[PDB]
Amino acid sequence: SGYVGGLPKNVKEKLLSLKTLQSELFEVEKEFQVEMFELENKFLQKYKPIWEQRSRIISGQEQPKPEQIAKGQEIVESLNETELLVDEEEQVKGIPSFWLTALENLPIVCDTITDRDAEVLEYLQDIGLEYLTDGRPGFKLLFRFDSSANPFFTNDILCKTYFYQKELGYSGDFIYDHAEGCEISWKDNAHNVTVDLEMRKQRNKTTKQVRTIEKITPIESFFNFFDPPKIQNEDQDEELEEDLEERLALDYSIGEQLKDKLIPRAVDWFTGAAL
Amino acid sequence: GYVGGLPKNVKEKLLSLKTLQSELFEVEKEFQVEMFELENKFLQKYKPIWEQRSRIISGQEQPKPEQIAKGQEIVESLNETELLVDEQVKGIPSFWLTALENLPIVCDTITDRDAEVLEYLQDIGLEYLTDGRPGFKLLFRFDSSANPFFTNDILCKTYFYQKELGYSGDFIYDHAEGCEISWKDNAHNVTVDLEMRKQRNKTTKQVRTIEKITPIESFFNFFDPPKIQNEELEEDLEERLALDYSIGEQLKDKLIPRAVDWFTGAAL
Numbered sequence A: 001s002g003y004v005g006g007l008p009k010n011v012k013e014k015l016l017s018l019k020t021l022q023s024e025l026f027e028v029e030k031e032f033q034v035e036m037f038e039l040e041n042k043f044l045q046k047y048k049p050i051w052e053q054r055s056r057i058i059s060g061q062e063q064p065k066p067e068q069i070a071k072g073q074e075i076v077e078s079l080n081e082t083e084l085l086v087d088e089e090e091q092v093k094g095i096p097s098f099w100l101t102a103l104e105n106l107p108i109v110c111d112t113i114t115d116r117d118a119e120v121l122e123y124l125q126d127i128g129l130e131y132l133t134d135g136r137p138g139f140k141l142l143f144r145f146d147s148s149a150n151p152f153f154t155n156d157i158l159c160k161t162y163f164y165q166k167e168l169g170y171s172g173d174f175i176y177d178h179a180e181g182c183e184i185s186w187k188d189n190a191h192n193v194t195v196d197l198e199m200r201k202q203r204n205k206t207t208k209q210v211r212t213i214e215k216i217t218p219i220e221s222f223f224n225f226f227d228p229p230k231i232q233n234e235d236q237d238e239e240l241e242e243d244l245e246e247r248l249a250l251d252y253s254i255g256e257q258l259k260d261k262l263i264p265r266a267v268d269w270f271t272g273a274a275l
Numbered sequence B: 001g002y003v004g005g006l007p008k009n010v011k012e013k014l015l016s017l018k019t020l021q022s023e024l025f026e027v028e029k030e031f032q033v034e035m036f037e038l039e040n041k042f043l044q045k046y047k048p049i050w051e052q053r054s055r056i057i058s059g060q061e062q063p064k065p066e067q068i069a070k071g072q073e074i075v076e077s078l079n080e081t082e083l084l085v086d087e088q089v090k091g092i093p094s095f096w097l098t099a100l101e102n103l104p105i106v107c108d109t110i111t112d113r114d115a116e117v118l119e120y121l122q123d124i125g126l127e128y129l130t131d132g133r134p135g136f137k138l139l140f141r142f143d144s145s146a147n148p149f150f151t152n153d154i155l156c157k158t159y160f161y162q163k164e165l166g167y168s169g170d171f172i173y174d175h176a177e178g179c180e181i182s183w184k185d186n187a188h189n190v191t192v193d194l195e196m197r198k199q200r201n202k203t204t205k206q207v208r209t210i211e212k213i214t215p216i217e218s219f220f221n222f223f224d225p226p227k228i229q230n231e232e233l234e235e236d237l238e239e240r241l242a243l244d245y246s247i248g249e250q251l252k253d254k255l256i257p258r259a260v261d262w263f264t265g266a267a268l
Helices: A009-059 A066-079 A100-106 A113-122 A222-226 A241-271 B008-059 B065-077 B097-102 B112-118 B218-223 B239-255 B259-264
Strands: A123-125 A137-144 A157-164 A176-181 A195-203 A212-219 B123-129 B135-142 B152-159 B172-180 B194-199 B206-215
Touching: A009 A123, A009 A241, A009 B008, A009 B065, A009 B239, A009 B259, A100 A113, A100 A123, A100 A241, A113 A123, A113 A222, A137 A212, A137 A241, A137 B194, A157 A222, A157 A241, A157 B218, A176 A241, A176 B172, A176 B239, A195 B206, A241 B008, B097 B123, B097 B259, B112 B218, B135 B239, B239 B259
Parallel strands: none
Antiparallel strands: A123 A137, A137 A157, A157 A176, A195 A212, B123 B135, B135 B152, B152 B172, B194 B206
16 A cells, blocks of 8 residues: 555556556446346246246156157266166156255255245245346246145245346446345245244233233244345444344355256256256 | 165156256357357457557556546545545556566465566466367566566466366366476576586586576466376375466456556455
8 A cells, every 4th residue: 555655646647547447448348247148148048948848847747758768868878877767667747846855955055944844845846047137137036836736825936036236346247236035925824934933821810811822933944035134224233234144145145056056957956966 | 865766757757857958058058159259259349458558557658648537536436545646767667566466366476586577577468269179368478678587578378178068067177288488597597496516627628517407486387387197196286286277267357357456456
């Protein structure tokens, strides 16, 4: 710091100007990000048709053509996986607990599903992904649950959005802003999960009156991923500014994981390969 | 084994997928291709602006008052007062030297002896590669005319990613190709320590001088990176190989793009 202050008029100006050329550079990096984005969008559009396809293979809604089955062995072998090979010799509907099993392995997340969350995830059919395309850049993760079989919520799709702030980062790339959950509709506080409820009946020696008391306690559950932390305010706190940051990190983190790994390599995440 | 011996109708479905995966692979391939082009596309938009900087640094061109004007603003708007002016010398001396002395992974690698070399460093450039394999080259333009060390004009380094994308669907570093250097005197070669010994034989009238060259730890080794071929050996001849790709990234994604800041410290 002291170094630069003692610089000669001559010099400083030389820098100044450079500081200017940086700004002009910034300008282009901006356009780069844009084209960067759109491109990415474009291709997602291509990845989809495939995924939309595996969903079904996973729903059981559409069956495998021997073409694929065989073509697939050639690939199991070629990768030396084997585990996916069948025995020589001439049940359920669309492969059981797929996405649950998948999620069960995936590094950051897996250490999040809890016995009670498992039960719900069994009714998860697919995990989507879409770029915001319009105003405000970001990407939204979508979860399709079987409205007809799911006992926990009436919800069909549970989305989760991550908005990248419009202003580009120093490094020149996108920086988050905040996440926006897509709130669940449990059909019973008992089938809830996001919460744990204790109930205790107590007598009043004096009034003789009796009442049992229901207490609803927010618990650490996987689905809290749909109620992200909010940017409190500039009120100022302690340990509740570090604690409610390490949580933002984990949110965005988990987000990444799903978007860049789980989704794109589901199959292997189900098996254990990708591990 | 939690799959190995389980159901058939299931494993069957799986396979069908493992295949659709492969259909992904090739679309992610097509992606990474246009992906790469776009980057190169814009690199070409970066050079000119950067080139401008080189000349402003070399002194080969003066700052337009217009440019100084904007800067004045900018710096204030960025709360970087440290670089203003209220009411001799050539282009910025020891620019790239200073910038590197602040660049986190690198600086810890410049020996006292090779700073003096780095004083004749005029510019670090970037270039991508479709000319076969995928990768990029860092070009170091040295002041040929004044450098006492090597008559080389342009040093550099090429980083090569292997043809097949990784599992992650991105590239993996294959190896690097150094741009080597032509020192003009062993005593001037910082990449080496040198002992000397003269020997005069009195009844022969002949002198015999011996110069020994042992490799030293130097920043300029950057241009003589580890080769794929050759316990203890690999665990070590892999840490540097790592540190090396690391440095490149450091120059490519930081030093080069934010030169100024790196010079001043703002980048920190």
